[PDB]
Each structure stands twice: as structure tokens, then as C-alpha cells.
């Protein structure tokens, strides 16, 4: 029956578990809205992630430096849910939301343009415009290895393969027929991802191993 106690100090009695989500809801249909993520504890968390004891809470929105990192972070998922449309048998390796923005290295033989990278962010305008929802399963180390396993992911295999422990739970995130793994947390839906644009491409080295293969870092930014 957790208690949550939000930033201004009023707290909520509730008789089961319930998400940063549920509680939005509950506060006002305006906060549901804008509601992106929660801080549950001092931790980052998604919008559906349930709250099981007393908790201290807080709503992350777009206005919350870490509602716009969210959104970057999901316009990286974004890309590659597009970029998996455009050039099928690409692979997605590491695309995180850095200073100002984020990137996605990919594995493609097709060494992209600039027109190649226009048409990439237009794909993924007209994917996100969609607003679909973002459904996020925790899984098993090895759930989460056959899936990129099956979807040819050499790179995402090789990240559990060295860098997730056999006694983690992987979280995937699907973006319709595309899914990614991640920390998150991630947007609850693509409607808070309309604001971005693609910039420049670079040359990566995975895992920053000259004797490895160089990848294609492809840029962008975000806002909201
Ligand atoms: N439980 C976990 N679930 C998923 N990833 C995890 C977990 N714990 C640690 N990680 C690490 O966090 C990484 C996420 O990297 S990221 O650059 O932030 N994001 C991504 O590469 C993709 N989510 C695309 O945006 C994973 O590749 C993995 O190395």
C-alpha cells in the first residue's frame, strides 16, 4: 500500500502498486499529458515503471533538463526504427544522448549521403508523427540475446555478450517493428519526439579500436 510523496511534500495513499503515470493521472489530466518519465527515489524510471512501497516522487516533463534528454535519447530509437525502413539489413551498435543532442553508429556497406541522410530524417518524421505508443519489456540476459540474435544485430549481441551481466534484466523498448535496448528511460509515446533534425556523419571506430570496423556516426539534436 505505498505512500508517494511528491516534491512539494503532499503525499498520496495508495492500496497497490501504481506508475509515475497512474499518479499524473491521478494529480490532473494536464500533467498526464506532459508526463515523460518519473524520478522515483533519487532514480530516473519510465512513465510505466510501477512504484511498489512508499516513494519519494517526482513527474519528469519537456521542461525538466532530463524530459529533453529523455526525448533525445528516444529520437536516437528513432533512427534506428527508421533507418531499419530505409536499409534493412543495417545494423545499430551504440546511440546515446550526449551534450546538446545525440548520435546511433551504424554498420551499413552503403556509405550515406547527405541526400541519403535527408531522407533518413524524413522517414523518421513521418514515423514519429504517427505517435505511436513505446512499449518497454524487461526480459531476460538471453531473451534479449535471441532478439538481436534473430534481427542479425551482431553488435547489440556483442554488447551482451561483454558489457550486461547474465543476472541483468535487459530492458527493450519496441517502436512497432523495431526494438532497441536501453537503460532509459525512454519517451511513453513519439508524440514528445516531433522537434528533431539530423546534422553531419563521422567515422567511428566500434568500441573505439582502430583495428575494428568504422562505423557511421550519424548525428542529431533534439528539443522540445
Ligand atoms: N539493464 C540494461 N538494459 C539495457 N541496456 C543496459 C542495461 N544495463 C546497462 N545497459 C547498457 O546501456 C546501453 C545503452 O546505450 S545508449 O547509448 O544509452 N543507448 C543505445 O545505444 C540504444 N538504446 C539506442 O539509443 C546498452 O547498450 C548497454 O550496454
Not at 500500500?1 to 489530466?29: C, E, F, K, N
Not at 543495417?90 to 556497406?109: C, E, Q, R
Not at 526494438?179 to 568500441?207: E, I, Q, S
Request: hydrophobic share 35%; proline share 4%.
Amino acid at each position: 500500500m505505498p505512500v508517494i510523496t511528491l516534491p512539494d511534500g503532499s503525499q498520496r495513499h495508495y492500496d497497490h502498486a501504481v506508475s509515475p503515470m497512474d499518479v499524473a493521472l491521478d494529480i490532473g489530466p494536464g500533467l498526464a499529458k506532459a508526463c515523460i518519465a518519473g524520478r522515483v527515489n533519487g532514480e530516473l524510471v519510465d512513465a510505466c515503471d510501477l512504484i511498489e512501497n512508499d516513494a519519494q516522487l517526482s513527474i519528469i516533463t519537456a521542461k525538466d533538463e532530463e524530459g529533453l534528454e529523455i526525448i533525445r535519447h528516444s529520437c536516437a530509437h528513432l533512427l534506428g526504427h527508421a533507418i531499419k525502413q530505409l536499409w534493412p539489413h543495417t545494423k545499430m551498435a551504440i546511440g546515446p544522448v550526449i551534450d546538446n543532442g545525440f548520435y546511433y553508429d551504424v554498420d551499413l556497406d552503403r556509405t550515406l549521403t547527405q541526400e541519403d541522410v535527408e531522407a533518413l530524417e524524413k522517414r523518421m518524421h513521418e514515423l514519429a508523427e504517427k505517435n505511436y505508443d513505446v512499449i518497454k519489456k524487461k526480459v531476460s540476459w538471453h531473451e534479449a540475446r535471441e532478439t538481436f540474435a534473430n534481427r542479425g544485430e551482431s553488435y547489440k549481441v556483442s554488447i551482451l555478450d561483454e558489457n550486461i551481466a547474465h543476472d541483468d534484466k535487459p530492458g527493450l523498448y519496441f517502436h512497432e517493428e523495431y526494438v532497441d535496448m536501453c537503460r532509459g528511460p525512454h519517451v511513453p509515446n513519439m508524440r514528445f519526439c516531433h522537434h528533431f533534425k539530423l546534422m553531419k556523419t563521422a567515422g567511428a571506430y566500434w568500441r573505439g579500436d582502430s583495428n575494428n570496423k568504422m562505423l557511421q556516426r550519424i548525428y542529431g539534436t533534439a528539443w522540445a
